[PDB]
Amino acid sequence: MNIGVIILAAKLLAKIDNTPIIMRTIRIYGDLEKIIIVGKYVNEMLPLLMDQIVIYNPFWNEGISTSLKLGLRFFKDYDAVLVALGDMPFVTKEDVNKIINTFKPNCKAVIPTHKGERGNPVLISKSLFNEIEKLRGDVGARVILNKIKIEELCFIECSEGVLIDI
Amino acid sequence: MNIGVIILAAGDKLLAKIDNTPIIMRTIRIYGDLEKIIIVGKYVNEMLPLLMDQIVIYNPFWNEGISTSLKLGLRFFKDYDAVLVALGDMPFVTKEDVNKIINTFKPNCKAVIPTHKGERGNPVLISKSLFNEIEKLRGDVGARVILNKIKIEELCFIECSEGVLIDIDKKE
């Protein structure tokens, strides 16, 4: 299925068992097609993201929405995108399979949950792309999800990692 | 119009200055307020500091050749009507030149090629139709392989300045 991970990255270079966190994050998505969107600290971590397709967002200061619109363009033909944050190195590989496997034919999105909280990454299907294209400001996943009826929102429970943003 | 500009800047010298301004710098000015991104590779680290005001795509496959960079920037404008492929080492093209090129874009044209005294140059304006064709490229080939494929009955030309024919380079 056409599922592409959009890693958002405008700390991040803080090691965890000798590997900088942004790198831990990037590889929990393994074989999945992904693209890293980078702004704030781009120059500081660029040499660490050179094995990746990286898009530098000049408009990062203008709010997370600009990073997500860009990242989206590279997958506009995909069935859905997985919006992950580079900030969370604890999301499990299993958590990912979960969020992806539970993406059924009537799901407009899939939201991970842990002990009563919704976390990330959020699986967003093609049907919503257009919606996130109108998005403006420092808004993002929350704002678009509120747009759908709970009847069309799927979910599954994952490790606590789906909630830990370091 | 849905016409995006892809400035191939992956394919060191681009940082050199011409009258106090970087070459890639000048090359960008020429396309003005047009929808554009610039693709870099091996010199992302040195390049970027001069592009903090532009959408920059780093190609991890820079070692494989110009086709990867073109497919990559092309992926960023997949829905648009056409893309103008520009080279970051050609800072002498003129705004007037560009307008002539994009304006010459008619429903008959599967591609618009800049010309100066019979000479076919760049930046070449490629239409949505060839998009699939270019995605078929491999290695360090480039779009001109495809331009030759298409028939003259659908390949528009338009006389421009000599900038369309000149590039800048470095001596080993």
Automatic annotation (TrEMBL), chain B:
Disulfide bonds join 109-156. It holds the Pfam family NTP_transf_3. Gene3D superfamilies: Spore Coat Polysaccharide Biosynthesis Protein SpsA, Chain A. InterPro entries: MobA-like_NTP_Trfase, Nucleotide-diphossugar_trans. One of its GO terms (biological process) is Mo(VI)-molybdopterin cytosine dinucleotide biosynthetic process. Residues 5-149 form the MobA-like NTP transferase domain. GO terms for molecular function: molybdenum cofactor cytidylyltransferase activity. This is MobA-like NTP transferase domain-containing protein. It comes from Saccharolobus solfataricus (strain ATCC 35092 / DSM 1617 / JCM 11322 / P2).
